[PDB]
């Protein structure tokens, strides 16, 4: 492809490769005073809108746009269906900016037809910590595709981020764009196998009959780490220490403050689940996963796939395998149908033993305005929503 938008942006060209001695911006010495103060032009009949995600009705508009128009799998079986409470959690992290939650309305109907968002975070890339924006939830209504609206949303959010003297961003996508810093496949561990077969995701064969599949994926309802329990506010200092220490080994990770640990990990039912093991007043192990249902397109029995996605997991008292077997059990106890994980951090090491299957996509990780060496996905230490 020609990437005629992306080639105007400060990202690597498709054949660029940089060695470990290079870890810097494409464009440095940027000046906030020089940033354009005018909003980017939209086509006639469309207007910018600043969404207030803490207002239930604006949030509901974003929820409806994404439910009807967001990411589908390659096979068009599923569309992601982030909940409105999830959107509130994802977008109102510490020191978030309302003005980075950008909608576009079609004036004649007053309906939201496009969205993009970012939140601020400190990202460590090859041992250099940089303030970045983490961009997510880019969406154009399905009736307005291939009209070049996405570059207008990208340029408008870049402008507003640059007004805060932030000049780098991190983002992920299942599409290939110039140019990933790493690329991680999805893997899935079936929990409710019969439902996964019925909706057309999992398969059977003459060796693996339905009863044999159910037995294969059966799990014992006993934790390997007996005192794993939901995280509470008392555990924030300990989680900050256990996770922060663990993440320092990776080539790309977020540098969480204590306030960020409280926001990203304290549990919210049907949104984020974090469990900890406390021994002697120290947090020695943690499991976390978030809820991301998919709408099952056209299905008359099931409308929703409830899926848990692995977030951050660290063990110092058990094996990683035993930890992840406990995460699958915790997701099963919370009614999830499947447990999904990327091949980042230590995860790929347990996929075969814990009977995960390889999915069809991969998720590519990108930086904006940063040149550096790429690296294998076990050296990625960040999970975006
Ligand atoms: C310093 C601050 C920096 C801040 C900004 C950082 C960068 C943030 C970047 C955003 C990160 C978002 C991360 C995130 O949200 C997580 S990835 C999920 C993105 N959302 C979806 O896939 C939802 C369903 N699809 C859509 O809504 C549309 O297809 C979208 C809106 C995706 C494209 O709408 P469209 O109607 O299909 O297409 P046009 O308007 O005609 O636009 C065509 C151009 O858009 C480029 N494109 C397509 N998909 C992209 C994607 N996923 N990222 C980046 N760029 C993407 C494409 O390559 C082409 O450019 P090119 O001609 O050069 O090839
Ligand atoms: C059954 C296992 O879960 C998925 O395969 C799944 C479900 N819903 C989606 C909706 C949109 C979608 O867009 C790529 C993918 C999925 C996927 S695969 C990649 C995410 C994971 N795991
Ligand atoms: Cl322009
Ligand atoms: Mg378009």
Author numbering: 26 to 410
Verbatim from the authors:
N-Myristoyltransferase (NMT, EC 2.3.1.97) catalyses the transfer of the fatty acid chain C14:0 from myristoyl coenzyme A (MyrCoA) to the N-terminal glycine residue of substrate proteins. This co- and post-translational modification is ubiquitous in eukaryotic organisms and plays a central role in a variety of cellular processes such as the addressing and reversible anchoring of proteins to membranes. In particular, NMT has been validated as a pharmacological target in fungal infections, in a range of parasitic diseases caused by Trypanosoma,7Leishmania8 and Plasmodium protozoa and filarial nematodes, and as a potential target for the treatment of cancer. Herein, we report the synthesis and the structure-guided optimization of a series of quinolines with balanced activity against both Plasmodium vivax and Plasmodium falciparum N-myristoyltransferase (NMT).
First, compound 1 was co-crystallized with PvNMT and S-(2-oxo)pentadecyl-coenzyme A, a non-hydrolysable myristoyl-coenzyme A analogue,26 and the structure of the resulting ternary complex was solved by X-ray crystallography. Overall, 1 adopts a binding mode similar to the original hit compound, 3-butyl-4-((2-cyanoethyl)thio)-6-methoxy-2-methylquinoline (MRT00057965), which we identified in 2012 by high throughput screening. The quinoline fits into a hydrophobic pocket, where it establishes parallel-displaced π–π stacking interactions with the adjacent side-chains of Phe103 and Phe105. The binding of the quinoline ring is reinforced by the establishment of an H-bond between its nitrogen and the hydroxyl function of Ser319. Additionally, the nitrile function of the 2-cyanoethylthioether chain appears to interact with the imidazole ring of His213 (distance ∼3.0 Å). The ligand is modelled bound to the protein at half maximal occupancy due to the low affinity of binding. This is mirrored in the two orientations of residues His213 and Tyr211, corresponding to the bound and free forms. Interestingly, the ester function, introduced to improve the solubility and log P of the hit compound, also establishes polar interactions with PvNMT, through water-mediated H-bonds. The X-ray structure of the complex between 1 and PvNMT shows that a cluster of water molecules surrounds the sulfur atom of the thioether chain. Superposition of the three quinoline–PvNMT complexes present in the asymmetric unit of the crystal shows that the ethyl ester group is flexible and able to adopt different conformations in a relatively large pocket, suggesting that the ethyl chain is suboptimal and that the enzyme may tolerate larger substituents.
